[PDB]
C-alpha cells in the first residue's frame, strides 16, 4: 500500500492511497521543551505550557527541516502506524517550491526514512485531478497561503502561478482583532482556537459586500450567537462576512495585494490566449479557506465582471475540498498507470536527490 502525505502550513493530512479521505488530520506543529525530546500535533498543543510550539511550514514552504523530520516521523509511526521502509510514499509541495527544497525532501525520505519509493506532486495539481480534470485553474487556499495555479493537459504552468500570502490564519487573526476591539479579549493560543472555531462555524462571503453591510446596519437578521468557554454568549453580525471579505479586499488587514478574484483573472490572463476559455469554464476551489458559504457565487460574480461578456464562467467547489489535495494524491498513487512513475530508492542511490526533477 502506498502512503499519501499532504503537508500544509496548518494541518497535516495523511493516509493510504486508495482511501476516500486522510485517516490522520492533525496540526502541523512541533513542540520542544521550554527548559531542557519533542511532541507533534494535538499532544504538543495539550502540553503547550511546557513546550515552545513551532510550525515547520510557512506559507506552504518548509522552513524548519529538523522539525519537519519530526512531523514526518510522527506521521508514519504514531498516526499511520506504519514502517516507512515498507511503503512507497507520495508527498505534496507548494506551487513555486524551490528546487533545493524538493531535493531536501527527497534526501530525507530516502536516507532518513528509507522509503522504498517516493514522488512529489504540486498540491493544486492534485486538487484538479480530484475534480476529474487535467485542464483548469485551481484556487487553493489553506491556513498559510493562497495560490492560483493554471494547469494544461495535466501540468501546472509555472509562469502564470499567482501567490497571495493571505489565508486562513490571517482571517482568524483578523477576527481575533475585531472581537478583541469589541471587548472580548482573544490573544492567547487557547483563545485563537476559539476564534478559529467561530470563523469556521459562522463566517460567510457576501455576494455584494456593500448591500450586506447595509442589511447588517439596519436589521438583526444576519446575527448569530456563539457560547464561549467562559459561558459568555457573543453575537456577531457584519463580522461574519467582513472577516472573509479580506480575501477579496486584502486592504482590510493592511495588505496592498490584489484580492483572490483579481489573482484568478490575472493568472488566466498570463496563460496562452487559446486556453483561456477552458480555464474560465474550469475554475476549481481547493482548501479549507474556500469553505465559506457564498464564496463560489461571489467568485462567479467577480470573474464575470472582469472577463469578456460572452465568456462561459464556471466555479467548481467540491464538498470534499478541505481534502481535495489529499484525494488527488490518493487517486494518483493508487493508479495502475502511475506505478512506473515512482522514484525508487535504487534510482536515488544511483543518481542522488536531483532525480526528483
Ligand atoms: C475516470 O478515470 C479515472 C479512474 C479512477 C481511478 C482511481 N480512482 C481512485 C483510485 O484510482 C480513487 N478515488 C478515490 C481514491 O482513489 C476517491 N474518490 C473520492 C475520494 O477518494 C470521492 C469522495 C471524490 C471523487 O469522486 C473523486 C473523483 C475522481 C476522478 O474519478 C478522478 C479521475 O478522473 O481520475 C483519473 C485520472 C486523473 O484524471 C483527472 C489524473 C490523476 C491523471 C493524471 C495523469 O495520469 C498525469 C497527467 C482516472 C484515470
Ligand atoms: N468551514 C470552514 N470555513 C472557513 N475556514 C475553514 C473551514 N474549515 C477549515 N477552514 C480553514 O482552513 C484552513 C486549513 O485548510 P488546509 O488544510 O487546506 O490548509 P493547509 O494545507 O494547512 O495550509 P496551506 O495550504 O495554506 O499551506 C484553516 O485556516 C482553517 O481554519
Ligand atoms: Ca495545503
Sequence spans of domains, the chain: 1-29+57-120+323-355, 30-54, 122-167+257-318, 168-253
Q: Say how many Å lie between the CA of residue 127 and the centre of ligand 1.
A: 10
**Which residues, by Cβ under 5 Å, contact ligand 3, an ion?**
8, 142
**DSSP conformational letter for 151:** E
Which run of H or of E encompasses 327? helix 324-334
Task: Tell me if 287 CB under 6 Å of ligand 2.
Answer: yes
Q: How far apart are CA 11 and CA 19, in angstroms?
A: 18
Pick the CATH number of 168-253 from 3.20.20.80, 3.30.160.60, 3.90.640.10, 3.90.120.10: 3.90.640.10
| Helices 123-130 and 324-334: angle between axes, nearest 10 degrees | 80
Residue 177 burial (CB count, 10 A): 14
Q: How far apart are CA 348 and CA 351, in angstroms?
A: 5
Strand partners, 118: 89, 343
Q: How far apart are CA 230 and CA 250, in angstroms?
A: 32
Task: Tell me if 60 CB under 6 Å of ligand 2.
Answer: yes
Q: Which ligand 2 atom sits nearest the alpha carbon of residue 57?
A: 27
Q: Which fold would CATH assign to domain 1-29+57-120+323-355?
A: Nucleotidyltransferase; domain 5 (3.30.420)
DSSP H helices, 51-139, are 65-74, 99-107, 123-130
Pairing of strands 24-27, 11-16: antiparallel
Q: Say how many Å lie between the CA of residue 19 and the centre of ligand 1.
A: 11
Can you give the resolution of this entry in Å?
A: 1.6
Name 256's Cβ contacts closer than 8 Å, sequence gap at least 6: 250
Nearest residue (by CA) to ligand 1, atom 20, is: 20
Same fold for the domain at 1-29+57-120+323-355 and the one at 30-54?
no
HSE toward the beta carbon, residue 155, CA cutoff 13 A: 4
Name 53's Cβ contacts closer than 8 Å, sequence gap at least 6: 29, 30, 31, 44, 45, 189
Experimental method of this PDB entry: X-ray
Pairing of strands 233-236, 136-141: unpaired
Q: By CB neighbour count within 10 A (0-12 exposed, 13-18 middle, 19+ buried), where does 227 fall?
A: exposed
Which residue's entry shows cell 442589511? 215
Task: Tell me if 331 CB under 6 Å of ligand 1.
Answer: yes
Best mutation site among 143, 175, 239, 285 for ligand 2 pocket (most ligand atoms within 8 Å of CB): 143
Q: What is the 3-state secondary structure (H, E, C) of 164-198?
A: ECCCHHHHHHHHHHHHHHCCCCCCCHHHHHHHHHH
Q: How far apart are CA 121 and CA 343, in angstroms?
A: 12
Residue 77 burial (CB count, 10 A): 13
Q: Say how many Å lie between the CA of residue 310 and the centre of ligand 2.
A: 34
The answer to whether 131 and 290 are in contact (CB under 8 A) is no
Strand partners, 234: 226
Residue 78 burial (CB count, 10 A): 13
Q: How far apart are CA 60 and CA 57, in angstroms?
A: 6
The answer to whether 9 and 144 are in contact (CB under 8 A) is yes
Strand ranges in 238-331 using DSSP code E only, listed in sequence order: 283-286, 315-316
**DSSP conformational letter for 271:** S
At the top level of CATH, the class of 122-167+257-318 is: alpha beta
Name 52's Cβ contacts closer than 8 Å, sequence gap at least 6: 31, 32, 33, 34
Q: Say how many Å lie between the CA of residue 10 and the centre of ligand 2.
A: 7
Q: How far apart are CA 115 and CA 110, in angstroms?
A: 5
Task: Tell me if 167 CB under 6 Å of ligand 2.
Answer: yes
CA of 143, nearest ligand number: 2
Q: Backbone phi, then psi, for 263, in 5-degree steps? A: -65, -40
Q: How far apart are CA 262 and CA 164, in angstroms?
A: 11
Task: Tell me if 27 CB under 6 Å of ligand 2.
Answer: no
Q: Which fold would CATH assign to domain 30-54?
A: Actin; Chain A, domain 2 (2.30.36)
Q: Say how many Å lie between the CA of residue 68 and the centre of ligand 2.
A: 19
| Helices 260-270 and 295-306: angle between axes, nearest 10 degrees | 50
Q: Say how many Å lie between the CA of residue 142 and the centre of ligand 3.
A: 5
Task: Give, in order, the Cα–Cα distances in Å from 327 to each of 34, 73, 318, 320.
Answer: 37, 22, 11, 9
Task: Tell me if 135 CB under 6 Å of ligand 1.
Answer: no
Residue 338 burial (CB count, 10 A): 15
Amino acid at each position: 500500500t502506498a502512503l499519501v502525505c499532504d503537508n500544509g502550513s496548518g494541518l497535516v493530512k495523511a493516509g493510504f492511497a486508495g482511501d476516500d479521505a486522510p485517516r490522520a488530520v492533525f496540526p502541523s506543529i512541533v513542540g520542544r521543551p521550554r527548559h531542557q525530546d519533542s511532541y507533534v500535533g494535538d499532544e504538543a498543543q495539550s502540553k503547550r505550557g511546557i513546550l515552545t510550539l513551532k510550525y515547520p511550514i510557512e506559507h506552504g514552504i518548509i522552513t524548519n527541516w529538523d522539525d519537519m523530520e519530526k512531523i514526518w516521523h510522527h506521521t508514519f509511526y504514531n498516526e499511520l502506524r506504519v514502517a516507512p521502509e515498507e511503503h512507497p510514499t507520495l508527498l505534496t509541495e507548494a506551487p513555486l517550491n524551490p528546487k533545493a527544497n524538493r531535493e531536501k525532501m527527497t534526501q530525507i525520505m530516502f536516507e532518513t526514512f528509507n522509503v522504498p519509493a517516493m514522488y512529489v506532486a504540486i498540491q493544486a495539481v492534485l486538487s484538479l485531478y480530484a475534480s476529474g480534470r487535467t485542464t483548469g485553474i485551481v484556487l487553493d487556499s489553506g491556513d498559510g497561503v493562497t495560490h492560483n495555479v493554471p494547469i494544461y493537459e495535466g501540468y501546472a504552468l509555472p509562469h502564470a502561478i499567482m501567490r497571495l500570502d493571505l489565508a486562513g490564519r490571517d482571517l482568524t487573526d483578523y477576527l481575533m482583532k475585531i472581537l478583541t476591539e469589541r471587548g472580548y479579549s482573544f490573544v492567547t493560543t487557547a483563545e485563537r482556537e476559539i476564534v478559529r472555531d467561530i470563523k469556521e462555524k459562522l463566517c460567510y462571503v457576501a455576494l455584494d459586500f456593500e448591500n450586506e453591510m447595509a442589511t447588517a446596519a439596519s436589521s438583526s437578521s444576519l446575527e448569530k450567537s456563539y457560547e464561549l468557554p467562559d459561558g459568555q454568549v457573543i453575537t456577531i453580525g457584519n463580522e461574519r462576512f467582513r472577516c472573509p471579505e479580506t480575501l477579496f479586499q486584502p486592504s482590510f488587514i493592511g495588505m496592498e495585494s490584489a484580492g483572490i478574484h483579481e489573482t484568478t483573472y490575472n493568472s488566466i490572463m498570463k496563460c496562452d490566449i487559446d486556453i483561456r476559455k477552458d480555464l474560465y469554464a474550469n475554475n476549481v476551489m481547493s482548501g479549507g479557506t474556500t469553505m465559506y458559504p457564498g464564496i463560489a457565487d461571489r467568485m462567479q460574480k467577480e470573474i464575470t465582471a472582469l472577463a469578456p461578456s460572452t465568456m462561459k464562467i464556471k466555479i467548481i467547489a467540491p464538498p470534499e475540498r478541505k481534502y481535495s489535495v489529499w484525494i488527488g494524491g490518493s487517486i494518483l498513487a493508487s493508479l495502475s498507470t502511475f506505478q512506473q512513475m515512482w522514484i525508487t530508492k535504487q534510482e536515488y542511490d544511483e543518481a542522488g536527490p536531483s532525480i526528483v526533477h
